[PDB]
Design a protein around this nucleic acid. Structure first.
Ligand SMILES: C[C@H]1O[C@@H](Oc2ccccc2[N+](=O)[O-])[C@H](O)[C@@H](O)[C@H]1O
Ligand SMILES: C[C@H]1O[C@@H](Oc2ccccc2[N+](=O)[O-])[C@H](O)[C@@H](O)[C@H]1O
Lengths: 329, 329
DNA sequence: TGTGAGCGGATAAC
DNA sequence: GTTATCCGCTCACA
C-alpha cells in the first residue's frame, strides 16, 4: 500500500512531523533539511491520502451532486459546467447518479453524498414539493440547492424561467397568426415538463386559444415521433406545435415530413433547449435557449455562498430566449 | 456534526462495538439487544462516515474514472453505464473530468484519482502510445484499463472494432456500387478518429478506390456542416460519404440538402455510433452501432477482474454492426 | 460482546 | 522544529 509520511521519514532521516512541515510549506524548516526531504518524497512518489487529510480536519470545500441519469442531455451538460466551474474555483466535486425513479432513491443518493462529508449539495433531480422539503431536511446541517423543483417550492433553487420560455414560444406562434396549435409535453413525472406544460396553457389562454391536441413524450426523439404520428393519424393536423424539448421536436419534425407535410410551411415547430444539434436540423429548429453553462456555473457559485452563510436564500430565475430558425414560418 | 457510532451507544445503552456489530450484520448479538440498537440508530439518523470507513481499512472496490468532457455524447453514455453497472455490483465510483487537452492534464486527473485511493482506474481519454504507457506507469500499483487508445498499445484496453466498423461501411457503399466516395473524419487529435480514418483507407484500398475528398471535423454537427459545404463549393461532389460519427453526419446531411441534393438518392451517407437521435434524422441515418452500455458494463467487470489479479491482461475488442436506414440508396 | 492499538495527518501548544 | 494526542473506525483479542 501507498507511500506513507512515515516512509519519507526514514528515507530522509527525519520524523513524520518534519516531512509534514515541508509538505505544508512550513514555518521554520532546517533550510537544507527541506531540500533533502523534498528529494526523498520525489524519488518515492508521495501522494497525500486525502481520505486521511479530511478525517484529520483539513477544511477542504467539497461539492456533492445528486443528478438524474447522465445519459440525458441537460443533466450531463450541467454536471459538466458544474465540475468545470468547480475546478476553476479550486473546489472538488463528487457526484451520485440516481437512476431508479422515486424519492427513496434520491434520498439514498443524498445519504452517500452526506457520508462523504460534502460541504454542500446540489440536487438536479425531479422532486415534488414536500419530497423536496424532506430531502432538504435530511441534509443534516449542510446547504442544499435545487435545480429541478418548482419556483413555488420553499427551498433554495435555480431554474430557467419557464414563464418566459413558454410565453416567448406562444407569442411567437400567435404573431405568426397560428390558432390551431398542438402541444407535445415532456413526461409528467418531470417537474420541469409540467412547468412548461402549464406555461403553455397559461399564455395560450391569455390569447383565447385552446390546444387542439395535447400529447406526452419522454424526452426522446422516438417519442416525439410516435406521438406526432398517432396525432396525425387521428386526423388532427395543427399548423404549429410547441414541443417540450429539441429532441422530441426532431421526432416531431420527422413524422411531419414523412407524412408529406412541410415543417415550417405546413406545420411550424418550436423546441426547447437549443441543443448544439438543433441548429443543423432539417430545417434548422426554432427553439427556446437554456444556457446550461450558466446554470451549472451559477449553481456552484451559489452553493458556495450559502455554505458561507451568505444571505441569498430562496429561488432564483435564469433568463431564457427565443432563437428564430426555420421551423416557424 | 453528524450522528456518531458513539451517539447510538448511549441512546441504546451499549458500547461503540455493540452498535458496530449490529451495523455489520454481526456474529453473535444479544438477540433482543440488536432489536433495541437498530431502533436507536433509526430514531437518530445514522449515516456511516465513509471517509472514516475507508481510512479504517474497509476494502471498497472504489473505481476511479478519468474521462473526456461529459459534454460529449459517448463519454457521458459511458460514464453512465459505468456508474450503473458499478452500483449493481455494490462498487463505488469517483470520476475526474479532464477538459484541458494534453497528457499533463490527464496525469493531473490520474493523480487526484490516486489520492482518493481508488482500487483501479478506467481511463476514457485519448492517449498516444507512449503517453498511455506513462499514465499506465503513474498508476502506482493499481490496475488501469484504457478505452481511448489504439489496439496496438501494449496495455489493458477495451475498444470497439474500428476494423469491423470501417469495413462494414465501405463494403456497404461499394455493394451499392459507389466509387466516388468522400471522407469526413473526426479530429485527428483523437485516437479513435484516426483509427476510423485508417480503417476507411485500409478497406477503400482493398476495393481499389480512392477518396475523392477527405476532410476533418470536430465531432460537432456544425463542423460536419461547414466541411461538407466547403467540399461542395469546391465542386467536389461524391455519391456517398463516410462520416466519423452520427452528429457530423447530421451536419453533412444538412449541407447536402440545403444544396438541392437528395441525401440517399444523390449523395448517400453513413454515420458512426447509432446515437438515439440518429434514427429520426431526415431521413433516418444508416450508421455503425457502438453499444455504449456494453462498453461501460464490460469496463467495470474487467477492472474488477484485474483488481483481483485475474489473468485477463491485454486489449479487448467489442463487436459493432451495420444499421441500414435510409441514407444509403 | 467489552477492551486496546494503529490508519495518514493536523494543529496548537510544547 | 518537535511532541502529544484525537479524527471516527475496523478488528483482532480477549
Ligand atoms: C435546463 C433545464 O432543462 C431540463 O432538461 C431536460 C431533462 C432531461 C432530458 C432533456 C431535457 N431537456 O431540456 O431537453 C432540466 O430537467 C431542468 O431541470 C433544467 O436543467
Ligand atoms: C465508443 C467510443 O467512441 C468514441 O466517442 C466519441 C467521442 C466524442 C464524440 C463522439 C464520439 N464518437 O464516437 O462519435 C470515444 O472516443 C471512445 O472513447 C469510445 O467512447
Amino acid at each position: 500500500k501507498p507511500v506513507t509520511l512515515y516512509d519519507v521519514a526514514e528515507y530522509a532521516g527525519v520524523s513524520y512531523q518534519t516531512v509534514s512541515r515541508v509538505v505544508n510549506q512550513a514555518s521554520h524548516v532546517s533550510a537544507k533539511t527541506r531540500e533533502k526531504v523534498e528529494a526523498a518524497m520525489a524519488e518515492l512518489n508521495y501522494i497525500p491520502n486525502r481520505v486521511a487529510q479530511q478525517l484529520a480536519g483539513k477544511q477542504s470545500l467539497l461539492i456533492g451532486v445528486a443528478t438524474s441519469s447522465l445519459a440525458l442531455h441537460a443533466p450531463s451538460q450541467i454536471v459538466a459546467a458544474i465540475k468545470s466551474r468547480a475546478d476553476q474555483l479550486g473546489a472538488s466535486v463528487v457526484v451520485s447518479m440516481v437512476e431508479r425513479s422515486g424519492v427513496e432513491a434520491c434520498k439514498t443518493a443524498v445519504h452517500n453524498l452526506l457520508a462523504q462529508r460534502v460541504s454542500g449539495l446540489i440536487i438536479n433531480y425531479p422532486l415534488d414539493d414536500q419530497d423536496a422539503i424532506a430531502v432538504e431536511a435530511a441534509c443534516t446541517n449542510v446547504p442544499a440547492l435545487f435545480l429541478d423543483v418548482s419556483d413555488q417550492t420553499p427551498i433554495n433553487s435555480i431554474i430557467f424561467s419557464h414563464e418566459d420560455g413558454t410565453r416567448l414560444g406562444v407569442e411567437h406562434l400567435v404573431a405568426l397568426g397560428h390558432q390551431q396549435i398542438a402541444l407535445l409535453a415532456g413526461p409528467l413525472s418531470s417537474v420541469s415538463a409540467r412547468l412548461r406544460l402549464a406555461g403553455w396553457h397559461k399564455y395560450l389562454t391569455r390569447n383565447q386559444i385552446q390546444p387542439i391536441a395535447e400529447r406526452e413524450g419522454d424526452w426522446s426523439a422516438m417519442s416525439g415521433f410516435q406521438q406526432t404520428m398517432q396525432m396525425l393519424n387521428e386526423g388532427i393536423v395543427p399548423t404549429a406545435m410547441l414541443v417540450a424539448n429539441d429532441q422530441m421536436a426532431l421526432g416531431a419534425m420527422r413524422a411531419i415530413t414523412e407524412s408529406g407535410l412541410r415543417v415550417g410551411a405546413d406545420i411550424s415547430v418550436v423546441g426547447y433547449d437549443d441543443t448544439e444539434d438543433s441548429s443543423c436540423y432539417i430545417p434548422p429548429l426554432t427553439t427556446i435557449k437554456q444556457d446550461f453553462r450558466l446554470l451549472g456555473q451559477t449553481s456552484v457559485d451559489r452553493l458556495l455562498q450559502l455554505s458561507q452563510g451568505q444571505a441569498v436564500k430562496g429561488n432564483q430565475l435564469l433568463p431564457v430566449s427565443l432563437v428564430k430558425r426555420k421551423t416557424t414560418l
